[PDB]
Amino acid sequence: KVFGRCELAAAMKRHGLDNYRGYSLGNWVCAAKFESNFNTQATNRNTDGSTDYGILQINSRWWCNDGRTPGSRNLCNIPCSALLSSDITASVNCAKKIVSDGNGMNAWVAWRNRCKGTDVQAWIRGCRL
């Protein structure tokens, strides 16, 4: 599913990401934009052999099981395919664990390089929230 910007903001807010670990909703919308272009089906294979899945590009080395990332973990206790659903519930629950892991949203390389230090409130402007 390719979300609209405000449609995703609304879904993230309902699932409790607005100010989760102190990160306002615009941070999460910006992250999704530059990770996946708001596409739940986005996948990308990494040089280490791991794959990033779904609207927040959650990685198979630590967070999900895809059966093809040797020596990896599954700390969200989910098949990586769950992160590609039109239903963002699994992606959100896993993202809450990731952002609590120690480095905050710096875990998302596109957030650190393209959202951090920018006017992230702009990503929720005009939305009915």
Swiss-Prot record:
Q: Which domain of life is it from?
A: Eukaryota
Q: What is known about the tissue distribution of this protein? A: In the egg white and polymorphonuclear leukocytes.
Q: Where does substrate bind?
A: 101
Record flagged with keyword Cell inner membrane:
no
Q: Where in the cell is it found?
A: Secreted
What is a single Pfam family found in this protein's UniProt entry? Lys
Q: Name one GO cellular component term.
A: extracellular space
Query: Which cysteines are cross-linked by disulfides?
Result: 6-127, 30-115, 64-80, 76-94
Q: State the PROSITE patterns in the record.
A: GLYCOSYL_HYDROL_F22_1, GLYCOSYL_HYDROL_F22_2
Which keywords does the record carry? Allergen, Antimicrobial, Bacteriolytic enzyme, Disulfide bond, Glycosidase, Hydrolase, Secreted, Signal
* Chain ranges passing through the membrane: none
Q: What are the EC numbers?
A: 3.2.1.17
Task: From the UniProt record, list the reaction(s) this protein catalyses.
Answer: Hydrolysis of (1->4)-beta-linkages between N-acetylmuramic acid and N-acetyl-D-glucosamine residues in a peptidoglycan and between N-acetyl-D-glucosamine residues in chitodextrins
Which residues carry out catalysis?
35, 52
InterPro entries associated with the record: Glyco_hydro_22, Glyco_hydro_22_CS, Glyco_hydro_22_lys, Lysozyme-like_dom_sf
Function of this protein? Answer: Lysozymes have primarily a bacteriolytic function; those in tissues and body fluids are associated with the monocyte-macrophage system and enhance the activity of immunoagents. Has bacteriolytic activity against M.luteus.
Q: Which family does it belong to?
A: Belongs to the glycosyl hydrolase 22 family.
User: Do you know which PANTHER family this protein is assigned to?
Assistant: LYSOZYME C
Q: What else is known?
A: Lysozyme C is capable of both hydrolysis and transglycosylation; it also shows a slight esterase activity. It acts rapidly on both peptide-substituted and unsubstituted peptidoglycan, and slowly on chitin oligosaccharides.
What protein does this entry describe?
Lysozyme C
What is the native source organism of this protein?
Gallus gallus (Chicken)
